[PDB]
């Protein structure tokens, strides 16, 4: 409404603002940020590490996109093994042979009972 421009949301933060040129209203969103995590095997085992940018799209920034975040330094493999190092939404990384590979964790062996 024509009143003013200091738009705010439930979080009591300046969600939207109007400029002294057009009365255009621009929504203000925080610049992309997150926490970085280093997935590493035992130090004696190897010095290679993988970096997971959680909650950060890979476009914003070898590089693999998980729903938990952007995982760089690990190569995705279709075959499923048991979880070794937790990563996020169903993805676990392990040091397999020469490199760190990320995979969708396998719940267990498939067994069918002949009922």
């Amino acid at each position: 409404l024509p009143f003013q421009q200091f738009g705010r949301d439930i979080a009591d933060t300046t969600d939207a603002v109007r400029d002294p040129q057009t009365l255009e209203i621009l929504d203000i969103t925080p610049c992309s940020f997150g926490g970085v995590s280093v997935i590493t095997p035992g130090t004696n085992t190897s010095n290679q590490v993988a970096v997971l940018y959680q909650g950060v799209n890979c476009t914003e920034v070898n590089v693999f996109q998980t729903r938990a975040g952007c995982l760089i330094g690990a190569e995705y493999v279709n075959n499923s093994y048991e979880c070794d190092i937790p990563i996020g939404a169903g993805i676990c990384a392990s040091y397999q042979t020469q490199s760190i590979i990320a995979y969708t964790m396998s719940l267990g062996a498939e067994n069918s009972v002949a009922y």
């Binding site: 949301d9 439930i10 979080a11 009591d12 933060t13 969103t29 925080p30 940020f33 997150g34 926490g35 959680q54 909650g55 729903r67 938990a68 979880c83 937790p86 996020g88 939404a89 169903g90 964790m105 719940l107 267990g108 062996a109 498939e110 067994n111 069918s112 009972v113 002949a114 009922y115």
Partner: protein, 407 residues
């Protein structure tokens, strides 16, 4: 009275729902961004306050890993993913409501889908972490448990899965509660109809009353309340001239700026400490709930429990788990006696100078003849030597009656 007993001549099968919270959302808070934004001077002042930030980070990480461990312990008890055979005949028992539905892409049972349907903060350095186990994998674990408990009984829990027809498994469960398996073999159709009707009523009860799923909703609301309280207290003055850090930075002289920044820091540190303490207390409560849920899964689902009221109300027969958002729903199948009838009873039968006690069951009389029946069901039988042992004399026992023992 001193010589009256009541024995049920019928029974009903009641299915009850028990909902337990299992895990809570994992939250990670960035100390520097929450308390100081993007100003380096505020970070420098916070640096000398000590190691509060790393303590809070460690506490939050511990809570997150505890939630993951709780989910894994509750749901990943089984070791092999069992699959239901394509032909879904189980002697008149209908499990369509609890078995996964291949038609829907979610691969969830209708009850699970109903539960899932029934049930901003990132902007200030607060992050929610995705759970280790996705909903698909939890549903897969639940389906594996259901297939194991349907096709193998309780054998898969204690070792390799052993084949067994479902009526035979139900007969063994009936023998578990002290009722002979004949009762099931002569009332299979009635029992299956009652079970199907109860399963059908479960969905209606869940859909009609939304207060049943109140626990998980309360957990989610509490989390949202805590996060909103943190974000709202980000704007508190705490005795300062203004809540905006950049305004103070670009508006005040360096000493007064330091004073106001220190005030804001003290306020935000105490706010974060209170939030973390609340988070730890809620995490402890959720851990207790998850331990209880895991115990129920191990006892109610993977076996038959003799503990009263632990697995539903009444004599426990079996249980079925159902995945729910941040929790598990247990469907307890129980045996409830009904249609009681009173009879005249005696502790022992006096024959040819010898007492006779029932090997199993009790002695009942309908007015003119004496019979022996099992405790929980009324099936009269001729009092014979095979089901009675003498072990004593007639004078010592109080309340003994005269009758002939057939042979």
């Amino acid at each position: 009275s001193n010589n009256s007993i009541a024995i049920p001549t019928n029974f009903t099968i009641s299915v009850t729902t028990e909902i337990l919270p299992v895990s809570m959302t994992k939250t990670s808070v960035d100390c520097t961004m929450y308390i100081c934004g993007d100003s380096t001077e505020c970070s420098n002042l916070l640096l000398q306050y000590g190691s509060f930030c790393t303590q809070l980070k460690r506490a939050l990480t511990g809570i997150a890993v505890e939630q993951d461990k709780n989910t894994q312990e509750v749901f990943a008890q089984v070791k092999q993913i069992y699959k239901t055979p394509p032909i879904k005949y189980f002697g008149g028992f209908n499990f369509s409501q609890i078995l996964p539905d291949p038609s829907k892409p979610s691969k969830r049972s209708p009850i699970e889908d109903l539960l899932f349907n029934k049930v901003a903060q990132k902007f200030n350095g607060l992050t929610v972490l995705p759970p280790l186990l996705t909903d698909e994998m939890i549903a897969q674990y639940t389906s594996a448990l259901l297939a194991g408990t349907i096709t193998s009984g309780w054998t898969f829990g204690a070792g390799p899965a052993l084949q067994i027809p479902f009526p035979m498994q139900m007969a063994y469960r009936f023998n578990g509660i002290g009722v002979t398996q004949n009762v099931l073999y002569e009332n299979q159709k009635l029992i299956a109809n009652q079970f199907n009707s109860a399963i059908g009523k479960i969905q209606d009860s869940l859909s009609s009353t939304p207060s049943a799923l109140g626990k998980l909703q309360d957990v989610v609301n509490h989390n949202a309340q805590a996060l909103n309280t943190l974000v709202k207290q980000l704007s508190s003055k705490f005795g300062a001239i203004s809540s905006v850090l950049n305004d103070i930075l670009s508006r005040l002289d360096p000493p007064e700026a330091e004073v106001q920044i220190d005030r804001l820091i003290t306020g935000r540190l105490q706010s974060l400490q209170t939030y973390v303490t609340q988070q730890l207390i809620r995490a402890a409560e959720i851990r207790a709930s998850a331990n209880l849920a895991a115990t129920k899964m191990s006892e109610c689902v993977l076996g038959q429990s003799k503990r009263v009221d632990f697995c539903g109300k009444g004599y426990h027969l079996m249980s079925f788990p159902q995945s729910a958002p941040h929790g598990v729903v247990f469907l307890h199948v129980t045996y409830v006696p009904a249609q009681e009838k009173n009879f005249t009873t005696a502790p022992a039968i006096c024959h040819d100078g010898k007492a006779h006690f029932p090997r199993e069951g009790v002695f009942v009389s309908n007015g003119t003849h004496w019979f022996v029946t099992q405790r929980n069901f009324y099936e009269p039988q001729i009092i014979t030597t095979d089901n009675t042992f003498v072990s004593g004399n007639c004078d010592v026992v109080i309340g003994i009656v005269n009758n002939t023992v057939y042979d």
